[PDB]
Amino acid sequence: ASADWKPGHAMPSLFKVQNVNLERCELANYKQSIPMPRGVHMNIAKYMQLCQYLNTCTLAVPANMRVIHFGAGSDKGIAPGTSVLRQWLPTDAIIIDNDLNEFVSDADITLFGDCVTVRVGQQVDLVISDMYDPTGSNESKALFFTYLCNLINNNLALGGSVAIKITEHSWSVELYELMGKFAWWTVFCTNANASSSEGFLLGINYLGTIKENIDGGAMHANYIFWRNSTPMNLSTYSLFDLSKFQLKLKGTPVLQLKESQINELVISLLSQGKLLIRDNDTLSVSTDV
Amino acid sequence: FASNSSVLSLVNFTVDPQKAYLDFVNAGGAPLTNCVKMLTPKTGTGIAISVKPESTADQETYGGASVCLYCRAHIEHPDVSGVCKYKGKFVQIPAQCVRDPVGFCLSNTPCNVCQYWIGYGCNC
Ligand SMILES: [Zn+2]
Ligand SMILES: [Zn+2]
């Protein structure tokens, strides 16, 4: 059972190309929960498995890497996911995190309040979102998704990536369509939470231009069809060997370029995870009014 | 539970939060729980406070802010620096002490030259 030793499952192109109606998500394992190794928060296992999958992706990993983490508060007032990011990322990476209510965190900067109050002054390299609102037919939601879509279009370095939590009912047409502006994309479901319709929508290496035309509503129907078609066993076996857990120290270069200078070579380097385009100044992410 | 809120409330009613906490747990009070225990290859150097997890086979690694009394209770840090020694870092706790990680950190000091815990690793 190789898949149980993997960190989770990624939506294959076999289901990306389907054409189906949106159906209810019905998972065989429901209400079945996984025991947590060593009395550890479930979010430790979930974030670690997300990181392990991102280790197989062509992430750009520069010096002074800029990481923003939304929905970082959990388990009444703490942020295990942020601590996992600190364990995973380069020691010189900057972590900014955010959630509605107060919590204590190992981030470099922690901002409380609605994500709309997080003012990203300069483009970032990696966005992690676990935002989920607790609140009849399943239509595209708006909420913080409007904010995230705007962030991808404006505040994300070319070559940067995103990992954004969605579920059967918490999802956005526009966010699926923005995955078409990355070199590669998928939905990733951790083995630790495989009995939930949760998935992480992954956009790897932002290109700022449409590489794949995606019908967002159709693609969410494809995502549910995939979940309905795919046995996934709860498992944290991938965490049994952590000797290679940390993100590779790639030294990815950061270049400033005009849009007119972005040619075939640059698009190729961005698409392979070998380049970021953004400012190389010192970062500033503040609270708005 | 509501007991975390209880002891975290208590240390706001005192001029010596370190003593309030230690006296509380030494008298049988429930230690603070919900500390952020990480999963690690227990192949680290074993120093007290580290930028990455460094647990040996006899230790567990915690997210630093979650085992800091001052961070958890949202009160002023004692350090002349004003900056927390744990927040943003990882803290190694001897495995025999995991029942109360906050109480351990309040009760011990890393070696100044050696950076291991005095009595739990420091050979100076
Ligand atoms: Zn602190
Ligand atoms: Zn020493």
For the stretch B109-122, what's the b/e string if a residue is b when 16 or more beta carbons lie within 10 angstroms of its beta carbon? ebbeeeebbeebbb
Which residues lie closer than 8 Å to A158 by C-beta, 6 or more apart? A206, A207, A208, A262, A270, A275, A276, A277, A278
A87 contacts B53? CB cut-off 8 A: yes
A86 contacts B63? CB cut-off 8 A: yes
How far is the C-alpha of A49 from the C-alpha of B32, rounded, in Å? 28
B71 contacts A104? CB cut-off 8 A: yes
Domain around B25: 1-124
Which residues lie closer than 8 Å to A260 by C-beta, 6 or more apart? none
Q: Where are the domains of chain A?
A: 1-289
How far is the C-alpha of A16 from the C-alpha of A218, rounded, in Å? 9
Contact B36, A83 (CB under 8 A): yes
How far is the C-alpha of A266 from the C-alpha of A203, rounded, in Å? 18
Strands A66-70 and B90-94: unpaired
What's the domain count of chain B?
1
Task: Please give the CATH number for the structural domain made up of A1-289.
Answer: 3.40.50.150
Give this entry's resolution in angstroms: 2.0
- Tokens coding A108: 């470099």
For chain B, the residues before each gap (C–N > 2.5 Å) are none
For residue B43, list chain A residues with Cβ-Cβ distance below 8 A: 243
For residue B38, list chain A residues with Cβ-Cβ distance below 8 A: 40, 44, 83-84, 87
Q: Hey, is B16 helix, strand or coil?
A: coil
Query: Residue A190 corresponds to which amino acid?
Result: T
Angle at A37 between CA A198 and CA B120, to 5 degrees: 135
Region of A117 please: left (phi>0), alpha (psi -120 to 50) or beta: alpha
Q: Hey, is B49 helix, strand or coil?
A: strand
Does B68 count as an annotated binding residue? yes
